[PDB]
Design an enzyme around this catalytic site. Structure first.
Site, PDB file in Angstrom:
ATOM      1  N   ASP A  80      -9.957  -0.313  -7.131  1.00 47.44           N
ATOM      2  CA  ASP A  80      -8.627  -0.100  -6.578  1.00 47.44           C
ATOM      3  C   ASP A  80      -8.282   1.379  -6.560  1.00 47.44           C
ATOM      4  OD1 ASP A  80      -6.141  -1.337  -5.534  1.00 47.44           O
ATOM      5  OD2 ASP A  80      -5.286  -0.262  -7.261  1.00 47.44           O
ATOM      6  N   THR A  89      -3.609  -0.656  -1.080  1.00 49.84           N
ATOM      7  CA  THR A  89      -3.580   0.773  -1.327  1.00 49.84           C
ATOM      8  C   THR A  89      -4.862   1.380  -0.812  1.00 49.84           C
ATOM      9  OG1 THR A  89      -4.701   0.683  -3.447  1.00 49.84           O
ATOM     10  CG2 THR A  89      -2.382   0.106  -3.396  1.00 49.84           C
ATOM     11  N   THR A  90      -5.966   0.712  -1.132  1.00 52.14           N
ATOM     12  CA  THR A  90      -7.210   0.889  -0.414  1.00 52.14           C
ATOM     13  C   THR A  90      -6.953   1.125   1.065  1.00 52.14           C
ATOM     14  OG1 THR A  90      -7.374  -1.474  -0.015  1.00 52.14           O
ATOM     15  CG2 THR A  90      -8.180  -0.661  -2.091  1.00 52.14           C
ATOM     16  N   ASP A 118      -3.896  -7.172 -10.349  1.00 47.68           N
ATOM     17  CA  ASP A 118      -3.853  -7.196  -8.898  1.00 47.68           C
ATOM     18  C   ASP A 118      -3.776  -8.625  -8.389  1.00 47.68           C
ATOM     19  OD1 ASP A 118      -4.647  -5.649  -6.185  1.00 47.68           O
ATOM     20  OD2 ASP A 118      -5.656  -7.594  -6.312  1.00 47.68           O
TER      21      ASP A 118
END
Lengths: 521, 525, 524
Positions: free
Chosen positions: B57, B90-91, B391
């Site tokens: 992440d 976010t990746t 996550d």
């Protein structure tokens, strides 16, 4: 070796030019930053952070210099910002340019004092000019204010969000009016709290009918949702607090030690029942909270918060109208936390927040800013700060000015009308300052990027006709535009201190003749 | 210019800093793009302190990849916000960002002034979100629905097998979490990790586990039926808050002073034991106590002679889970002591591992707080999976939060693209350019997906760039054959707000990013 | 922070400038410095200035170029204007002051229109065409095109203005002596070349006692006697005065005894015979810079002949011209036709300095020399520099014609003509010419500054007095009446040519310096 041992000194025209040059720099570094077509700047704080902001003040407030008048210029920016908020988009750019031509008579070997003398004359007409060309406005009408606000805010990146802020700015502003001064009620922008939370979107940020707390219930058993609670502001702590007189105990008998420990239990519980006797619901204090009492207050199912910041306690007090207490025994029911339309504590995502809504006619409010990233948020509120600030200034004066440079040319010829009728050596300075004024719309041209010279001459030519004074420069078309349809409208007082500040800058730097360093004290 | 003002200062310029910033993200996106997509590779970091990562992440990477370029740090912040908002993507988010700016650059490199393109973006997102709003699939909280979504999310980080094992625990937690209206994910979610016996055996426990054990050997390790004492008041000694200097005159009093001092705590423990004995008159029942503070050894002995389980020094949130576990009434004052204030458990033992001690709560009839005990072979992996776990959960909380759902794997972006490419210059024309690239930037997700999957990009995009018919489908890119796929049919999904916020987040990021000219640095020494 | 990025690390350490900022700001300011550097420079009221060079040499100065020559300026465009007037000075003389003033003023308003948004290119054209128009209108202002070739009085009245500008104190003396110089020189090598003038510097005996000679001087020693014959018979020999040694290494050789006697003996007699044959020509003086044979001078005294020594190629080149006699690389042949002829030659002592004097009376026209007497060599160097400028000023006068009114009035007419032409331009450039028209006021503006009176109304009345065609009236030189003076009766006139070039030259400098926008500078 005589004077001060390696402290530098300078005098006269070189000093004069040097101050002339630095301001020219000082104004220049920002000339990109005014106008609906402005640019937007991001800064390195010395310690690593980032601030991105168009408002010049912070930019200059974030500027380190060595030459003095720049720093002298610095404060002038922050002062007007402090008093007015914006115009900082423009005032200094006015200022240096005034100086920029102001030098032009230095080679004319004219003593600056007269040049000052004309200036004080010049501003007088200028203030008189604007008062003649001002327009009072109703303050009850929301939409024009909203128009005024967008007119006031269609310069910053929140431009895309004008509708939200305009009402947002209006609502908080309206709800802050402290009438115990008779009809001399005064609003405060420190009770106008601003809370920035990342995540969410601009659309999610909203005005809250009350206060928001970045804290949590001390105990789970206290409910996190209440309609019409009663709130206590205990300025004092909730626990046993020092016997202030370096007190001492000498027990001799066995039961004494155990006795005293109950007594502190007893002392604390004492506090609890005094609280409950007013049948409260919510407990707030800037200090700590005994869990043991909190057991009692849990036992009473009465909501409790510990160690809350004082200014918020005031705004919380100003939210629910109650008054803070440091004396549970002298607590008074006139400060019952009544005026509470809804009590809640939400989860923002990794943070509990305290939700205090629907006070009857609250005077305090915080604005909840929910965006992308705090530097984005911090930028927003600065624009919000200006937005709300001008509104109270509008709430301070109903008389309005049409900006867009329209007013600027109006005085410009007006002084030209004054100039030709004011024969003498001082005449040439007088027109020169008028010559100085013309740059702001001109500057607007560059930020748009249009044929500045032609448009300006025409605008002056346009404003040669007395019949029309609202003719100004559109932000985006870069075309001559009467303001009445355009609607970029401004508080007169905003422009007053603008010129007021501008000219003050001029005289102050002009009397200078000398530099002295190395004070060593 | 202002170098005149300050020699040591540093300034950039409009053309200059603009290129610098876009160059900055272009590099930044390049590193991270390897990751998102199940085929992606997590990355291992080494501290200057020597610590170790195995993460994927990006926010973790960005937060820990020591960089100085400011825009990245700015981008890092919102990414962290997004992590505080949803956790993955976010990746994608940054990959969205720089790639947009890259496409953005192409036009200004043609001299186009950026202000125009921003407005194109402004219009572009609006239409997109308009499409985004309508296209989300309203789905119930079907266990399988979320299950696939959990598997959809969890595969982003770990073995297909590992997440599949993980998938069951989280969803059932989610099922065992809601009071049908509002999750907070903090109390009912206990994430505890042990360096024990596997990675896979990490499991939900229907009860609770504790990070410490009893402080006495005679203490019962295991108890069939547990009656619970939740508390925080110290049963360690304490001396009162006032200076209270005592003396005596006799050593006999000295001992008399010995007993008196203890007497207060003596009563305190005495109140409980009577209650216990008022409660646990039966021999079979076992009595357990939990304190957030510490406990006197003499008190420990006091319980010991009564064979009473008690625990001290708990973190302030554990009791909530305990109350959410046993229905126990967490208290401070033991004088107001009632058996109804108690908590009950169907089984408790303690688990000793390594040097530490771990304690086990079992068999709530209707547990409302549970625990993700993490079994670990390797410390980093525990940390590694945990991020994947947290996550995964935050995916679900939004997933339940939103009664709708987005089919994942970038099928949306083509859908975004075609609809957005299906926009005439109803715009003022010049904005259609920025819209075009705005739409153009959107296709990166499958592009890198194919890229991370190794399949050739250009052809696959064209392939999937086939809305079929009146049923021009929400078609995904196969993650192992690079082929058109119904994410919905194959059950590849995503949170709508995720898709919602990221577009909003990136857009606002973009416009301001394009709207700077020089980067100032004139600070004190 | 602490880490901005660079989109182009192309430079290993150097200065690249861009964004017009330097052009719009830094280029201008540097120019503005030069104006400020020499604003005081010109003027009868303008005062001198001294600077030390990098090699610690004194230079009192009023001429801009020379002091400009003393400045290692490092701004590039600075040098441009520097070398501009430098060549301009090389072309005309004084005016260096003026052109720099033109330079700054042209620059000074230029950024203003540039800052006002006027096109740099259009600025160039308008600045260009106006100058062209200025050339067009310039000739119509010539008055009193002084013509008398070889009178003393006219040019004395004429050349004074050059003198007064760079020496306000001693015009009468300085006027007459160069006028003495100029009339003394006729068109001989072609129309009074300036280099036909030599200057000698002698300390002491203040300026009033400085003189001018119809001959030429040498501040060198002597070998025998010192005499003058009104019929001077001079021998000139670039050859060193000794037996012609073969350049090839030719070593005399002997085989027997009697060689030695006759060897030394014969050398003696032949040099005597050499010098005798010279003496038989009656040449009472021989000259050379080259090495001198000792017995020869021994003989030279024996026949009582004058000798001249160590003269550089220029010196004899001068001296050869003075006597009109051909220098002889060949020692022997004292040709009658190529032989010296002077009114009087001798040695004198002035200021405890040995002085070789060639007192001359030349009807055909001579390359004369001027005597500098006074205390301060620095004053001399200044005073000769101003003295030289008049000579070139004279020669430029001697070129064609057409004295014009100085004292700024002409340029007052110029601006009026330009400004009047300005409204007939119309277009966005109309301002550009108008500003350029405005520029010329700087000169009288500078004049008033050096006059130290309130310029502006001085301009105004001057402007006012010029509204009636009063082309010959201009700025006075007086604190008592800081109003006006009529230049023509004041005789304060100047060269058409001198102003013409500088204007074009100053024109050229600006269009060049204005031309560049972004800059690059490799490290020194």
């Amino acid at each position: 070796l005589v004077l001060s041992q390696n402290t530098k000194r300078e005098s006269g025209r070189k000093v004069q030019s040097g101050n002339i040059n630095a301001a020219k720099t000082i104004a220049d570094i920002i000339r990109t930053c005014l106008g609906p077509k402005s640019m937007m700047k991001m800064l390195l704080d010395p310690m690593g952070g980032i601030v991105m902001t168009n408002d010049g003040n912070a930019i200059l407030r974030e500027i380190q210099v060595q030459h003095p008048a720049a720093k002298s210029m610095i404060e002038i920016s922050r002062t007007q910002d402090e008093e007015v908020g914006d115009g900082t988009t423009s005032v200094i750019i006015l200022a240096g340019e005034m100086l920029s031509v102001a030098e032009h008579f230095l080679e004319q070997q004219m003593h600056p004092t007269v040049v000052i003398s004309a200036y004080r004359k010049a501003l007088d007409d200028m203030i008189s000019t604007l008062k003649k060309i001002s327009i009072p406005v109703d303050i009850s009408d929301s939409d024009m204010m909203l128009n005024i606000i967008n007119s006031s805010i269609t310069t910053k990146a929140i431009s895309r969000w004008s509708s939200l802020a305009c009402n947002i700015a209006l609502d908080a502003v309206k709800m802050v009016q402290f009438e115990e001064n008779g009809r001399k009620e005064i609003d405060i922008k420190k009770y106008a709290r601003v809370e920035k939370i990342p995540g969410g979107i601009i659309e999610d940020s909203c005005v809250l009918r009350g206060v928001m707390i970045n804290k949590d219930v001390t105990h789970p058993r206290m409910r996190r949702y209440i309609k019409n609670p009663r709130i206590v502001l205990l300025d004092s702590s909730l626990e046993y607090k020092k016997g202030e007189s370096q007190t001492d105990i000498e027990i001799t008998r066995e039961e004494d030690f155990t006795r005293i420990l109950q007594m502190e239990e007893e002392y604390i519980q004492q506090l609890c029942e005094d609280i409950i006797q007013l049948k409260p619901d919510v407990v707030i204090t800037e200090k700590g909270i005994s869990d043991l009492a909190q057991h009692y207050l849990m036992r009473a199912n009465i909501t409790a918060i510990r160690r809350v910041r004082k200014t918020d306690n005031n705004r919380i007090a100003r939210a629910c109208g109650a008054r803070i207490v440091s004396r549970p025994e002298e607590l008074r029911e006139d400060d019952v936390g009544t005026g509470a339309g809804l009590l809640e504590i939400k989860k923002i995502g990794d943070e509990y927040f305290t939700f205090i809504t629907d006070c009857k006619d609250p005077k305090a409010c915080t604005i909840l800013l929910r965006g992308a990233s705090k530097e984005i948020l911090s930028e927003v509120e600065r624009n919000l700060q200006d937005a709300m600030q001008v509104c109270r200034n509008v709430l301070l004066d109903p008389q309005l000015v049409p900006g867009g440079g329209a007013s600027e040319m109006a005085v410009a010829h007006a002084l030209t009308e004054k100039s030709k009728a004011m024969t003498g050596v001082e005449q040439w300075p007088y027109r020169a300052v008028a010559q100085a004024l013309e740059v702001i719309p001109r500057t607007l041209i560059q930020n748009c990027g249009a044929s500045t010279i032609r448009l300006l001459t025409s605008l002056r030519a346009k404003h040669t006709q007395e019949n029309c004074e609202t003719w100004g420069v559109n932000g985006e078309t870069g075309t001559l535009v009467d303001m009445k349809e355009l609607g970029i409208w401004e508080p007169l007082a905003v422009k007053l201190q603008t010129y007021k500040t501008a000219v003050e800058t001029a005289v102050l730097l002009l009397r200078i003749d000398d530099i002295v360093s190395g004070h060593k004290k | 210019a202002v170098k005149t003002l300050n020699p040591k200062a540093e300034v950039a310029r409009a053309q200059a800093a603009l290129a610098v910033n876009i160059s900055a993200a272009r590099g930044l996106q390049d590193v991270l793009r390897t990751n998102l997509g199940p085929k992606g590779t997590m990355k291992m970091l080494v501290s200057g302190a020597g610590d170790i990562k195995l993460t994927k992440d990006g926010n973790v990477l960005l937060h820990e990849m020591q960089i100085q370029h400011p825009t990245a740090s700015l981008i890092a912040k919102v990414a962290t916000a997004q992590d505080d908002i949803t956790g993955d993507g976010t990746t994608s988010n940054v990959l969205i960002i720089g790639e947009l700016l890259k496409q953005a650059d192409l036009y200004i490199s043609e001299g186009l002034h950026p202000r125009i393109i921003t407005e194109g973006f402004e219009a572009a997102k609006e239409k997109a979100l308009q499409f985004l709003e309508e296209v989300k699939v309203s789905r119930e909280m079907d266990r399988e629905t979320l299950i696939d979504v959990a598997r959809t999310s969890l595969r982003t980080k770990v073995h297909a097998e590992l997440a599949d094992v993980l998938t069951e625990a989280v969803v059932d937690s989610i099922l065992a979490i809601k009071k049908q209206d509002e999750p907070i994910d903090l109390f009912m979610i206990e994430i505890m990790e042990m360096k024990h016996k596997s990675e896979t055996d990490t499991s939900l426990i229907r009860g609770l586990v504790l990070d410490h054990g009893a402080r006495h050997p005679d203490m019962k390790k295991r108890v069939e039926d547990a009656y619970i004492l939740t508390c925080n008041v110290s049963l360690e000694y304490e001396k009162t808050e006032v200076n209270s200097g005592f003396f005596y005159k006799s050593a006999e009093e000295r001992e008399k002073l010995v007993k008196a001092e203890r007497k207060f705590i003596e009563d305190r423990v005495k109140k409980i034991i009577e209650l216990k004995r008022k409660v646990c008159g039966d021999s079979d029942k076992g009595f357990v106590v939990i304190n957030q503070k510490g406990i006197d050894p003499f008190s420990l002995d006091a319980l010991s002679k009564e064979g009473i389980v008690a625990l001290r020094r708990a973190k302030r949130r554990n009791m909530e889970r305990l109350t959410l576990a046993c229905g126990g009434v967490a208290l401070n004052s033991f004088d107001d002591l009632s058996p109804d204030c108690l908590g009950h458990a169907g089984l408790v033992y303690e688990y000793t591992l390594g040097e530490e001690k771990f304690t086990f709560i079992e068999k709530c009839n209707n547990p409302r707080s549970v625990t993700l005990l993490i079994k670990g072979p390797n410390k980093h992996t525990l940390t590694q999976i945990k991020d994947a776990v947290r996550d995964g959960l935050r995916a679900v909380k939004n997933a339940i939060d939103d009664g709708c759902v987005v089919p994942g794997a970038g099928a949306v972006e083509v859908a975004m693209a075609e609809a957005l490419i299906k926009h005439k210059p109803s715009v003022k024309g010049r904005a259609q350019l920025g819209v075009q690239a705005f739409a153009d930037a959107l296709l990166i997700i499958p592009k890198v997906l194919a890229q991370n999957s190794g399949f050739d990009l250009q052809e696959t995009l064209v392939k999937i760039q086939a809305e079929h018919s009146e049923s021009g489908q929400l078609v995904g890119v196969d993650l192992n054959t690079g082929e058109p796929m119904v994410a919905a049919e194959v059950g590849v999904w995503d949170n709508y707000c995720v898709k919602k916020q990221l577009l909003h987040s990136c857009t606002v990021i973009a416009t301001n990013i394009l709207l700077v000219d020089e980067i100032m640095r004139a600070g004190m020494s | 922070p602490k880490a901005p990025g660079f989109a182009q690390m192309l430079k290993e350490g150097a200065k690249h400038f861009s964004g017009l900022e330097e052009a719009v700001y830094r280029n201008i300011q540097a120019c503005k410095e030069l104006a400020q550097t020499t604003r005081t420079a010109y003027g009868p009221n303008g005062m001198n200035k001294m600077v030390i060079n990098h090699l610690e040499k004194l230079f009192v100065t009023n001429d801009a170029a020379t002091i400009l020559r003393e400045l290692e300026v490092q701004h590039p465009a600075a040098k441009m204007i520097v070398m501009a007037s430098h060549m301009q000075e090389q072309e005309v003389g004084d005016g260096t002051n003026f052109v720099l003033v033109f330079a700054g003023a042209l620059l000074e308003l230029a950024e203003e229109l540039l800052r006002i948004g006027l096109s740099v290119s259009e600025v160039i054209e308008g600045y260009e065409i106006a100058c062209r128009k200025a050339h067009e209108i310039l000739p119509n202002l010539v008055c009193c095109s002084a013509k008398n070739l070889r009178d003393i009085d006219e040019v004395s009245s004429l050349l004074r203005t050059s003198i007064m500008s760079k020496q306000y104190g001693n015009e009468v003396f300085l006027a007459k002596l160069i006028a003495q110089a100029c009339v003394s020189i006729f068109p001989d090598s072609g129309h009074f070349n300036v280099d036909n003038i030599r200057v000698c510097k002698i300390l002491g005996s203040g300026i009033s006692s400085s003189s001018v000679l119809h001959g030429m001087v040498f501040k060198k020693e002597t070998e025998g006697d010192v005499t003058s014959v009104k019929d001077a018979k001079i021998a000139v020999y670039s050859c060193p005065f000794d037996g012609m040694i073969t350049e090839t290494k030719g070593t005399v050789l002997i085989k027997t005894a009697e060689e030695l006697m006759n060897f030394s003996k014969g050398e003696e007699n032949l040099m005597d015979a050499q010098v005798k044959a010279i003496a038989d020509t009656g040449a009472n003086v021989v000259v050379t810079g080259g090495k001198v044979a000792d017995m020869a001078l021994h003989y030279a005294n024996k026949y009582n002949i004058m000798l001249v020594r160590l003269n550089s190629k220029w010196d004899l080149r001068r001296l050869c011209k003075t006597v009109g006699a051909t220098a002889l690389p060949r020692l022997t042949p004292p040709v009658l036709e190529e032989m010296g002829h002077c009114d009087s030659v001798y040695l004198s002592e002035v200021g405890d300095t040995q002085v070789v004097v060639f007192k001359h009376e030349k009807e055909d026209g001579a390359i004369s020399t001027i005597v500098l007497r006074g205390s301060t060599d620095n004053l001399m160097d200044d005073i000769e520099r101003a003295v030289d400028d008049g000579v070139n000023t004279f020669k430029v006068l001697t070129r064609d014609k057409r004295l014009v009114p100085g004292g700024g009035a002409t340029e007052i007419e110029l601006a009026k003509q330009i400004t009047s032409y300005g409204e007939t331009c119309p277009g966005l450039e109309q301002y550009a010419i108008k500003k350029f028209a405005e520029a010329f006021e700087a000169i009288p503006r500078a004049l008033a500054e050096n006059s130290g009176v309130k310029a502006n109304e001085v301009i105004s009345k001057l402007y006012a007095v010029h509204q009636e065609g009063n082309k010959n009236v201009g700025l006075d030189i007086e604190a008592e009446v800081p109003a006006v003076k009529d230049m023509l009766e004041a005789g304060i006139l100047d060269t058409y040519l001198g102003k013409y070039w500088a204007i074009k030259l100053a024109t050229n400098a600006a269009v060049t310096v204005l031309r560049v926008d972004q800059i690059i500078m490799a490290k020194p």
